[PDB]
């Protein structure tokens, strides 16, 4: 089982108009949530969407405006954002510096699935 | 409820020899995990402990050493670290700049407690 994953900034995967690195798959790691390290590149904005799976953002570097429903939030390093269920959300980076955040998402399914694997 | 919590660094609570900002409590937030934004100050180390709970570190800023049962894991921005269950873990910051990481921890008690809450909600 692998304790450490060194970040490889050369193998980010573009998805939702951002460049990310997903937590999963990770063999041996049983979690009740999913995650991703996300980079919104300068002068861009991520794809807008909503969903039935709880989510929060941990703001790591840079500055962005985060738009939830029709509202905007200035955000910066250290800020936490909880996205309400059924909310359109996306991230706007107007700065000449990459915007980094980590997202964690979870629901009933992911939590039960964690419990099942500890059973088995 | 609160959609956003702006970080105030001054309000961090010192514990295990680091400065932390715990996620919980957060009214109306139901999670199957806990967590915290942690800073190991320059030229300091955190309090070593072991536990049954699962735990993951997301390394945010700075360079530092995670010692897990005496083997040392050098880490930087972007690295992720799983803490094996019951391991003897702490964080060593030998240089001149703050070391930041986010810890997320979880167990059967926290997941089941999350499920019980939706059902009660
Ligand atoms: Na600093
Ligand atoms: Ni989302
Ligand atoms: Ni721990």
Automatic annotation (TrEMBL), chain A:
Chain ranges of the Cupin type-2 domain: 38-105
Keywords attached to this entry: Metal-binding
GO MF annotations, alphabetized: metal ion binding
Keyword Metal-binding found: yes
Superkingdom field: Bacteria
TM ranges: none
InterPro entries: Cupin_2 (IPR013096), GPI/OXD (IPR051610), Polyketide_Synth_CurC_prd (IPR016672), RmlC-like_jellyroll (IPR014710), RmlC_Cupin_sf (IPR011051)
Protein name: Photorhabdus luminescens subsp. laumondii TTO1 complete genome segment 15/17
Species the sequence originates in: Photorhabdus laumondii subsp. laumondii (strain DSM 15139 / CIP 105565 / TT01) (Photorhabdus luminescens subsp. laumondii)
Organism lineage: Bacteria, Pseudomonadati, Pseudomonadota, Gammaproteobacteria, Enterobacterales
